[PDB]
Amino acid sequence: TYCVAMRLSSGLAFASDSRTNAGVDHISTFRKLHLFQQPGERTLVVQSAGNLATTQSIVSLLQRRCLDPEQTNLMNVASMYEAATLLGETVREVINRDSGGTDFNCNLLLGGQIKGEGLRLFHIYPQGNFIEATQDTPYFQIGESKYGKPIIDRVLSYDTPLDQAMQCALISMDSTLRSNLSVGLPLDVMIYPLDSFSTEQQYRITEDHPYFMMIRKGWGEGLVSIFAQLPGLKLG
Amino acid sequence: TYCVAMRLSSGLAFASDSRTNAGVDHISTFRKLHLFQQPGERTLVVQSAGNLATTQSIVSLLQRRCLDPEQTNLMNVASMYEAATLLGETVREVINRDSTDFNCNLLLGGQIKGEGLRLFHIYPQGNFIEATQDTPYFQIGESKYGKPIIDRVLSYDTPLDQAMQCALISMDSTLRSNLSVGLPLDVMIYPLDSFSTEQQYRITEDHPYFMMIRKGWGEGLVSIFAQLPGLKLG
Amino acid sequence: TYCVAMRLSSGLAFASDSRTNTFRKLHLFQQPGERTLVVQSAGNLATTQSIVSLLQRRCLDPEQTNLMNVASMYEAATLLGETVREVINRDDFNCNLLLGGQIKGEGLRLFHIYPQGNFIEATQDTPYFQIGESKYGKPIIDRVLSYDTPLDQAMQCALISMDSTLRSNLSVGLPLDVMIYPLDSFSTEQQYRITEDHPYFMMIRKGWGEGLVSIFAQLPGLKLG
Amino acid sequence: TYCVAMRLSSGLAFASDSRTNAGVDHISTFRKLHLFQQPGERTLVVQSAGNLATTQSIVSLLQRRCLDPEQTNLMNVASMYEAATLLGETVREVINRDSDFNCNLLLGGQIKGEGLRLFHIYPQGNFIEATQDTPYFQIGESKYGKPIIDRVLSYDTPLDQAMQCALISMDSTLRSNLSVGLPLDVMIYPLDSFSTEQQYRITEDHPYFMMIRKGWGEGLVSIFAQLPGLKLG
Amino acid sequence: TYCVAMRLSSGLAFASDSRTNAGVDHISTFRKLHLFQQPGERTLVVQSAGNLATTQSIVSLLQRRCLDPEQTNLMNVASMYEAATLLGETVREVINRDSTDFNCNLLLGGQIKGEGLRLFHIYPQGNFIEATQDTPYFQIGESKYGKPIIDRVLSYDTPLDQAMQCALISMDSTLRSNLSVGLPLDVMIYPLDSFSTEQQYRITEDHPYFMMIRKGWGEGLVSIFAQLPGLKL
Amino acid sequence: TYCVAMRLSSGLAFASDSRTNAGVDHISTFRKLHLFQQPGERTLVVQSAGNLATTQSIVSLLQRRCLDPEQTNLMNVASMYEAATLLGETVREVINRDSTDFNCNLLLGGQIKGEGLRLFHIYPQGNFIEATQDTPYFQIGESKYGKPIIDRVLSYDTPLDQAMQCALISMDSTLRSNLSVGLPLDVMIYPLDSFSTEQQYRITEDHPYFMMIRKGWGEGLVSIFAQLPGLKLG
Amino acid sequence: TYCVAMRLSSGLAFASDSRTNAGVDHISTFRKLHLFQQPGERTLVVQSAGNLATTQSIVSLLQRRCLDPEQTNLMNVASMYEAATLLGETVREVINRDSTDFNCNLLLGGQIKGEGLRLFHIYPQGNFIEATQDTPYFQIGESKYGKPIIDRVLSYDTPLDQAMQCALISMDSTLRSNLSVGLPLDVMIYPLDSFSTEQQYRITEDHPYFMMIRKGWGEGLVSIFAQLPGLKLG
Amino acid sequence: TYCVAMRLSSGLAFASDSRTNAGVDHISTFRKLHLFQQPGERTLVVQSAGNLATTQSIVSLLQRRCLDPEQTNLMNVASMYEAATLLGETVREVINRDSGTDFNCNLLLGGQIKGEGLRLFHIYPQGNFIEATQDTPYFQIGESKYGKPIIDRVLSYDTPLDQAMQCALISMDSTLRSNLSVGLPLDVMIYPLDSFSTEQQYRITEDHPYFMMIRKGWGEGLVSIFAQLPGLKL
Ligand SMILES: [Cl-]
Ligand SMILES: [Cl-]
Ligand SMILES: [Cl-]
Ligand SMILES: [Cl-]
């Protein structure tokens, strides 16, 4: 479980793995990127980490309540801030129901755009409160995140173009996949261009995916080449 | 707090930062690489992570007891394995006296004449594991930031100087990404059969070569990134 | 005790053994033309039988939430959790449940209920759940089952899985209770009890066993150098 | 962690994975098959599962005590049965010292003057011995790989096929539980040979292993497809 | 996290750092100086300390409610005092919803046309105090390191540029002594009656003047120390 | 309440204020610097902060036991480390008997013949940390006001007299910024290998040199500020 | 925080300190004597003690509302009793809004034309009492230290100049005895039927007369003690 | 209830009132100065404040246990420090029994045991305690603030015994005049250094000539000093 989200001037980039810990001996594939879409009006992405029972319930309840117009839901919230308030309430609702402790805890990332607004990205905590990405901290990570953090800090900034933000996300994934076996393919990624309200750039990245293979091989080879040509060690 | 140690065919490489959390409003610099040296006979290195009160006491006890020939100490143990057994005992002794608040992790590496290079990781519980050709390095403290470069370029047959280059790059990525890790560094190269502590160095913010390799690595990465083939998710 | 449930595009397949250490490990909550719910049990027998009995007894009370008047399978899963927690609070006794079936107005849904009373739902990415002594029978499921596998081949997969389990672990034993639930059918017709004398089960086991021995002998010779 | 050892009429076959759980967020590669060899006189194989620190200490102690003739060790114990008792004592010694800390071990090989013997040593230090009717032992994550062994292995199965059976068992296990992983360490011990030459490291790039996995998988899918149609009525 | 505000006769001076603790392994840069601006009419500065989720919700709710003319907001309150009461209400609202773990402190300083400069310190309870000529500045966050130079050099009558200087030296000493406080900085000079936000600046580690003033202060101090009379106890 | 101790290459420097909060409406003057000295053999300094009942009891018990040769005391401990352990043990003894209300912090520094200068910070839990060359000083009590000047000029190699000057300045800024700290002061300079407590001093409101250095420092700060480069942010 | 008010035959005398604790570790200077003056028609003095946020809100609300003739305010109330009532109402208003730790005490004194001098003590609950000839003064804050001198020398008929002397001696003893009370002071003499704030003063540490009255009282007192008859309790 | 004790170079001075609140409508006279005496060997004085029932049970238990040589008691403790420890144990003892802050008390314990100097303690309701030093040479319990200013301006560690008792009486007089919870008769005592005697112990009644004398002299003395002060120059 590793999800990352980036809020840039030109749009948002999302990447999630799918390797999930369901039990003592139950390691399986679950989608960790879900969409709430009203074409021409809103595009919302929810990413999951932590207890699978908890996050599946949060997504299911949200999806179900989207069908009830007499209730506050992700289709009739006026802004991304209200979506975050709503996500947080649902987090408390599900955790308190399942509880009798940190066992049922989750973290969520919520990102997107509602027509009438700019891009917004939030990190929701188990307590139900949340923080918002700014230009100074333009990305969020949830799950096993430290292996993939150094490359984002090296190359991502608020003004990084979308395609490069996504290359950065994939490289971040590559380093994580290589270093921690709790994170695993397939991947689910998405690029959201500003004011597009489009879900066309949604992709599942498997091991057989030709481009992910190439960027991994190219990056790896580039690094090994940089390393070999480093000037000789002079510690004295 | 981040320490790494590497056991290679030609020797050992050690790198430790010095930034320490002693109390919350008390974050300062403490050395996390200590030496037990017998010129021509043994070279043993201890790296510290976790509770500062606990690690300092363990090291002091080991240091005070090296001066007493009538008890087991790091100067009279016969193998690195007995050295590990002794460290393990002392951990349990210090933690049991002071009382996960008082927990520590240690790295123990070097050579005692008559045997090859050995490197151990000691746990709070006092048990330990040993580095092999398949898993030839250990990290303690805030280690994940710095792990990918090691997995990408380090193996048992990496020459000492490149292993040290790898450690420094590992530190660089850690320094950039987590503020609980901080300069100065204390690093050391132990060439096989040398029983020397001569290549022990303190790396400060002004160190010319550390500055150069960080800059060289960073610029190298930025260029590799820029030259990558265009995104094709379609 | 070993139970398996599969959620495919075209329907659901369930298989449970019955040896305990005979008790039913597959229960039906049936309303013809409206809903078909299957509950499977593994783990502490006292706990599981208590949970199942409360649920059945409450089906007789329409003024209470029960498996006959829940609006969706999601609510069915929520109810099961409440009952799990209710029994826990009242009284190690680990239990696991599988909940699968269909309520009209909704598609096929499948849940794994945990001892803590929380639960997960099967997806296209993870289209089956196992409870009980499950490791012996997992490799064949991974080899041949995917979300779009036909019901009959899914049931064949489940049976071979039982076979490997029956052969390897003596706490799992005949008879079997199995069921094929076709999409939108709301039927319990393809529910069957499989005993030692069942002709087709005998057939697939010998058929499967012989094939594997045949592939094995036909393998290219060992070359480890 | 998954280790299997097979005792046959013609020899022994051993297969171990190497994926190891050393600590929280520390899954690494460690060899789980170690050898105690006396050319022309003795060949002993020890396979490890469970707590890495415990098993490593046991192996290290055994290796170190082999250098001392004034002490009971795996070089001077008279039979495999005495070797098993020796392992068991060492298990208890290390566990009591380090005290969760539990391990399971497999012990197999031949001491000159005796036939092949194979033992499974438990964390309490006791042990059981392989027979002709139950001609293999497994430790670690073993259930996934058990059915294929029961279907095709017997006391009289030749060594090459026994090793093939181990490899398929490893394959179903690798595919089904991510705690088990490549590289592998395997070994074939021919009866009366006292040789350690047929020991191998199998990495992901190993051609025959790539081949046998591909061959077995395709075969299984063919048998499944050629099965008679479902008849539950 | 360290923010300071100074209310002087010729204007207001503000300085904020950006190092923030969002989670254990999440120390990041967040801006801690926010503006509510109506050209020619009002300029309001809000500084943040304490829980980030909490302070961001407070600022965001206020920003959103400014777009609603039918509701009390920072654009239609008549005095800086009503602004402060409004802040306190938003503080209690956020704390109640999200739940000292969620506690925050705020500084509110600025000017509404028809009134002089006003500066408030808002507490986690939603009540507040106001700066006077006797107590002309407030600090929030990690404040003790930087207090001695302010008490030493600042008074109600200090010219604006010297007040900003005091702030920068205050900041330097804090940076030098406590690692929870960190660059970049956000600073602002508000001259009396200007209703202007032009003099707002981001100070990075590369900022030429900040390097200069730190250097001058540091060498000046080291020279003062050396020229001290020899110790006579 | 503010205490600071510095361990330098040439000796140790100590300074403590005296303003103590003993009760709800009872803030009075109490000594926070106590000496255990055996001429020509040992000089040990203890500084106290936290609950007055607790620290006064710890000091009296240590003094009581110094008169009994049949039990471990500060007069017969072999190293400063065993002394720290003894302090930590006495802290736990008093806290448990009297019982965060009873908590205290202590500083312990000095020299025992046969070893170098050693300085410890003892925590209420009874464990402790040791000063090193990288962190050559400790503060207890109200310490943040007085830390920056120390970080600016103090180093392991600062000559003794300057270390004391730095301490007095630190004390001055604290006195000025927080009313829980107050004159008189009790200070001491311990030169390495001297084993003398001859340089212990009480600094009152009337102390001439302290008056001179305060006004001298204050005037100096104002002059430097004024000669700073003019503000240019545009 | 210490405030006193005296209602005498010839007028009123007021004195307050300024030391305020606004939060933990935030002890600073705040005015605790505020004026509401209508030249030739009213002179009202409000003195503050307790929670600063509470008292500052009370005074600010009162000041703002004086600018609103459409509302009851301290400028259009007919008598000091109506003023006390309004003050009590505002006390409840701020305390109920902000919500025992938001509590404050206030003194309200002066004269509104058409009635004589009046002085009130307003409590946190919003009710109040009024000074009479038998109890001609009120104190708020840290008051016990400065009470004996008032009881010994103050009466309803004490002249204004002597009354202020008593208040100053009351402060001196308090300043010397409790560190929550501190300079500068704000004092005022209000002569009967004057309606003037001409006699409003800030007393600093450098204030010539205050230094004189303090030294003079202190010196004289020590002299009295020396002239007492020898102790003979037997 | 007001008790004060002074520890000086030449001896100790004690003074206590007797007015006690035993119930809301039960305000009575009870002695608040008790003696534990061994002629030629020790003199201990215990002074009482707070809950009478608690205070009476403590003093009685100490008196009763003074009759049992097989138990730790105030007659066989080696030092005053051991006596304070004993009182604290008894304070906690009585409070835990009676509770199954209403039952809280404060105590003063002062005197001399042969072989030791003068010692004075203030015992807290928690059973912990502090000791008087040269820096704080007296303690007060009960309603103490009215009487604190005269002691601060007149008492020092080197103050002779007679002037110290005089200082205590004036302190009592001011308290009497300012607070109705404190009342005559008084119980006072002067203990000269190394005397181990209870002869200078006195009951001071309303009719006591010398106290009547010292009150009138001081009252007149103050009023005259007030009268000759320079006129207001604000
Ligand atoms: Cl609902
Ligand atoms: Cl020892
Ligand atoms: Cl890397
Ligand atoms: Cl009257």
Numbering used by the authors:
A (entry chain C): 1 to 100, 107 to 242
B (entry chain D), F (entry chain F), G (entry chain G): 1 to 99, 108 to 242
C (entry chain A): 1 to 21, 29 to 98, 109 to 242
D (entry chain B): 1 to 99, 109 to 242
E (entry chain E): 1 to 99, 108 to 241
H (entry chain H): 1 to 100, 108 to 241
Paper text:
Anbu shares distant sequence similarity with 20S proteasomes and even more distant similarity with HslV. The threonine, lysine and aspartate residues that form the catalytic triad in HslV and 20S proteasomes are conserved in Anbu. Based on the scattered phylogenetic distribution of Anbu with occurrences in cyanobacteria and proteobacteria, it has been suggested that Anbu may represent an ancestral form of the 20S proteasome or HslV. Anbu predominantly occurs in an operon of four genes in conserved order.
